[PDB]
Design a binder for this molecule. Structure first.
Ligand SMILES: O=C(Nc1cc(-c2ccccn2)nn1CCO)c1nc(C2CC2)ccc1Nc1cncnc1
Ligand SMILES: [Mg+2]
Ligand SMILES: [Zn+2]
Length: 313
């Protein structure tokens, strides 16, 4: 009860900033998460013993893939922490509980392959879940772990509160399907500009949490350039392996996934920043002004990719 988590000075200060990198010491990541839960939710939110057992079972169900791994889970959780801490009074008690857990669990049991590749492989999950295939699986894995003995971190919630939190988590995890992001942001853009955006309207809150989930999920493009540059290697390492597996099915992959077209990556990053990342953080900053540092960091990384093309690095 009186047992706080306390980080070294550099981490204690820098964890509050959006561009915080959780570092290469895997064994510090559970502690960093509990720290964030304690400050963002409270020391009373979860029974420490059940939370630690939950965290370690979640860790075990993330695979050793180059990008969609345990480090990504905790990285996405930290971006959500920074958003919640900079927007203190906008979110309910159940939302702060749900969203950190949603982020930690959002890529559970990811194999480093897109929904498209599962469909073309004819994977059993593509028959089980026709759209948002991996995201429905990630939610399924979250419920399974919550139901392990001693793992139910929501055990103190009423029946209706429990259903609400699991509904917040389901929608938040489904929203990480980038296919759903484009329409969600356009609707939030129209709602914001016509002045019809209303945070008392549950269907509006749902859309705003969806955009938050995309922002946290893409947050590797909001880090300092050396972090972003090296994380980009990890994501393309998955993309290129998926392209190899497309070639094994007799399908020429898209250039994004073709290791024979590495020269096209700088221009592919420009497209990604202009079409996905900058619009995301722009709409998020309009709705949640204190998230402006994510937009600034993203623009700085776009400028670095423009320098790579101009051969300045
Ligand atoms: O870069 C990403 N995507 C991309 C590459 C190309 C492309 C197109 C042509 C040629 C080369 N590349 N097009 N697109 C758009 C569709 O994903 C990317 N995607 C995702 C989520 C699966 C969507 C997450 C992070 C990403 N980047 C990243 C950069 N830095 C640090 N961490 C991550
Ligand atoms: Mg995902
Ligand atoms: Zn993710």
């Amino acid at each position: 009860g009186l047992m706080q988590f306390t980080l070294p000075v550099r981490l204690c200060k820098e964890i509050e900033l959006f561009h915080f990198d959780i570092g290469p010491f895997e064994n510090m990541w559970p502690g960093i998460f509990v720290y964030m839960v304690h400050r963002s939710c409270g020391t009373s939110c979860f029974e420490l013993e059940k939370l630690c057992r939950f965290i370690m079972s979640v860790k075990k169900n993330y695979r050793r893939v180059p990008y969609h791994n345990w480090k990504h889970a905790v990285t996405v959780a930290h971006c959500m922490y920074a958003i919640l801490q900079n927007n203190h009074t906008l979110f309910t008690d159940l939302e702060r509980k749900g969203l950190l857990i949603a982020c930690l669990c959002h890529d559970l049991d990811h194999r480093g392959f897109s929904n498209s590749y599962l469909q073309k492989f004819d994977h059993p999950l593509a028959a089980l879940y026709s759209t948002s295939t991996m995201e429905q699986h990630h939610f399924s894995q979250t419920v399974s772990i919550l139901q392990l003995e001693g793992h139910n971190i929501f055990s103190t919630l009423s029946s209706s509160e429990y259903e609400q939190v699991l509904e917040i988590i389901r929608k938040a995890i489904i929203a990480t399907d980038l296919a759903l992001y484009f329409g969600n942001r356009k609707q939030l853009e129209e709602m914001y500009q016509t002045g019809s955006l209303n945070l008392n309207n549950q269907s509006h809150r749902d859309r705003v949490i969806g955009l938050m989930m995309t922002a946290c999920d893409l947050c590797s493009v909001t880090k300092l350039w050396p972090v972003t540059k090296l994380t980009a290697n990890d994501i393309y390492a998955e993309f290129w392996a998926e392209g190899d597996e497309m070639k094994k099915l007799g399908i020429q992959p898209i250039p994004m996934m073709d290791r024979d077209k590495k020269d096209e990556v700088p221009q592919g990053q420009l497209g990604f920043y202009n079409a996905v990342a900058i619009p995301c953080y722009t709409t998020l900053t309009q709705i949640l002004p204190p998230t402006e540092p994510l937009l600034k960091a993203c623009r700085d990384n776009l400028s670095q990719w423009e320098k790579v093309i101009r051969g300045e690095e």
